[PDB]
Amino acid sequence: VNSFSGYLKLTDNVYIKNADIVEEAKKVKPTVVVNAANVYLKHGGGVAGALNKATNNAMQVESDDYIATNGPLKVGGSCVLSGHNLAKHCLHVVGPNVNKGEDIQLLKSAYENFNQHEVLLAPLLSAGIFGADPIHSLRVCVDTVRTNVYLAVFDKNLYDKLVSSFL
């Protein structure tokens, strides 16, 4: 049992809710919140911009130190950093960005990072400003993630379409 509430069960292990991931995280304080990161951990927009703003830029300051020490991530890769006031940890995951010409096939590799964590609160990877079709992202999520993932979708109209088109 956990405190996630109001989710619709899609499969054994995948759950979905029309919710603001920042508000979900502040309420639940999950062990892991997933960020829609880029390889430079530049948290300017989309989910990353929202999560970083909720940390009053502490996520960005921490990320700058990570990059100075370790260099950029890979597309499809991830790192674990602090969750600050949102979660114990933030799993920064880099989905391909179609607006950068990146190969959508890397989306499966991106979702595989979720399997290293028993429970996650997450957005749909590569959706939003990353340019992929969220219906496809949900399909890859369900077909890749085996651990328990609680998906938060901000946009009500896209949430409704994601549920109503799910096979």
The answer as to whether 4 is a domain residue is: no
Q: How far apart are CA 147 and CA 157, in angstroms?
A: 27
- Residue identified by tokens 């979708």 is 153
Residue 46 in domain: yes
159 domain-assigned: yes
Amino acid, single-letter form, for residue 72: P
Whether 2 is in a domain gets the answer no
Rg (CA), the chain: 14
**Count of the separate structural domains present in the chain:** 1
- Integer CA distances (angstroms), 134 to 17, 146, 152, in order: 14, 19, 12
CB 122 within 8 A of CB 149: yes
Question: Domain holding 75: CATH number?
Answer: 3.40.220.10
Tokens of 59: 């996520």
For residue 110, being part of any structural domain is answered with yes
Domain membership of residue 115 as a residue range: 14-165
Residue 5, domain member (yes or no): no
Query: What are the φ/ψ torsions at residue 35 (nearest 5 degrees)?
Result: -100, 140
Residue 3 lies in a domain: no
The per-residue DSSP string of 54-73 comes to HTTTHHHHHHHHHHHHH---
* Bridge partners of residue 80, in order along the sequence: 91
In a domain, 81, yes or no: yes
